[PDB]
Design a protein around this ligand. Structure first.
Ligand SMILES: *[C@@H]1O[C@H](CO)[C@@H](O)[C@H](O)[C@H]1NC(C)=O
Length: 208
């Protein structure tokens, strides 16, 4: 009983390409309890609504969280190119999702700020001909192929990262570049919620 959103409130939220995932089964949630702590700037859903998501019974609820600057709001949509959706973070297009952009108030103190926001501006793979570059896109619910070579913080805007690939990996080179955005007065964050419905497995219910 009782879903635990605590880990979200303790410490420094990772950068978008290192999003932390909290998984819930068999428990009871109060979503509007959690959002009461933040100033909520944006809240959009897919195949569900902000009202419905705060009040439905699911077989599973997944909550991704990460530091994210409000200024890159538009880059979250799969429409566009956008480094974010292509190389950093992508929600399921099959299951009902929600995305929330929130600022953390001064009076919320247990959440510490990083030096800046970092993201991956490019993730690509150079073929054997040493000419052709093939983008390495992030899949839903997965991390970037490049998370192994990109550090948790981008040191300097424009930094490049390369890895030589073994023949088991198909050969060639993995190439990534990182970008930075300056930290804001109050930290800004993103929350990705994904829900699933079952037949009898709908044990994630709002508390009454
Ligand atoms: C859930 O939390 C919100 C926080 O604003 C509160 O208003 C509401 O009464 C709570 N609901 C239940 C059933 O605890």
């Amino acid at each position: 009983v009782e879903c635990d959103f605590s880990p979200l409130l303790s410490g420094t939220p990772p950068q978008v390409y290192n999003f932390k995932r909290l998984v819930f089964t068999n428990c009871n949630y109060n979503l509007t309890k959690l959002l009461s702590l933040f100033s909520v700037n944006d809240f959009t859903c897919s195949q569900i609504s902000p009202a419905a998501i705060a009040s439905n019974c699911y077989s599973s609820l997944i909550l991704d969280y990460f530091s994210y600057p409000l200024s890159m709001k538009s880059d979250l949509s799969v429409s566009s190119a956008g480094p974010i959706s292509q190389f950093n973070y992508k929600q399921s297009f099959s299951n009902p999702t929600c995305l929330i952009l929130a600022t953390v108030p001064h009076n919320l103190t247990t959440i510490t700020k990083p030096l800046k926001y970092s993201y991956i501006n490019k993730c690509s793979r150079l073929l054997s001909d040493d000419r052709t570059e093939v983008p390495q896109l992030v899949n839903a619910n997965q991390y970037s192929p490049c998370v192994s070579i990109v550090p948790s913080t981008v040191w300097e805007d424009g930094d490049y990262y390369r890895k030589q690939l073994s023949p088991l990996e198909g050969g060639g080179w993995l190439v990534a570049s990182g970008s930075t955005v300056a930290m804001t007065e109050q930290l800004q964050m993103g929350f990705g919620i994904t829900v699933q419905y079952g037949t009898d497995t709908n044990s994630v219910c709002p508390k009454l």
